[PDB]
C-alpha cells in the first residue's frame with residue numbers, strides 16, 4: 001500500500017517512532033519519502049551483490065532480513081524480508097528501530113543523509129496533528 005502523508009505520520013507515532021533514538025517523526029517521514037515514497041511494497045534489487053532493499057524503509061537483505069537469496073547475507077532483525085512488504089508496518093518499524101540502534105544510527109541510509117540530514121523537514125508533519 002501507499003500511505004498518505006499524515007496517515008503514515010500518525011501510524012509511526014502510534015508505533016513509538018517519534019523521538020526513537022532521538023529521531024523525530026519528521027525525520028522518519030523524510031526517510032520513508034525518499035526511500036520508497038511511502039510504498040510498503042517497494043523493492044530495490046541490486047545486481048552487484050544480489051541484495052534487495054525492502055519496504056517503506058528500504059531495509060537491505062544482506063544485513064537485516066532474510067530473503068533466502070542474497071549471497072553472504074545475515075539477518076539482524078531475525079525476520080523474513082517478506083514481512084517488510086506488508087500493509088501492516090509493525091515489523092518494518094521494529095526492524096528500523098534495530099537498524100538505528102547500531103553506532104551510525106539513522107545515518108545508515110544514504111538517502112536520509114543526502115535529502116534529510118541537517119535540512120528543514122518540518123513540512124513532513126505539517127497539519128498532521130502529531
Ligand code: NA
Pocket residue numbers: 061062063064065066067070073074075
Ligand atoms: Na539476509
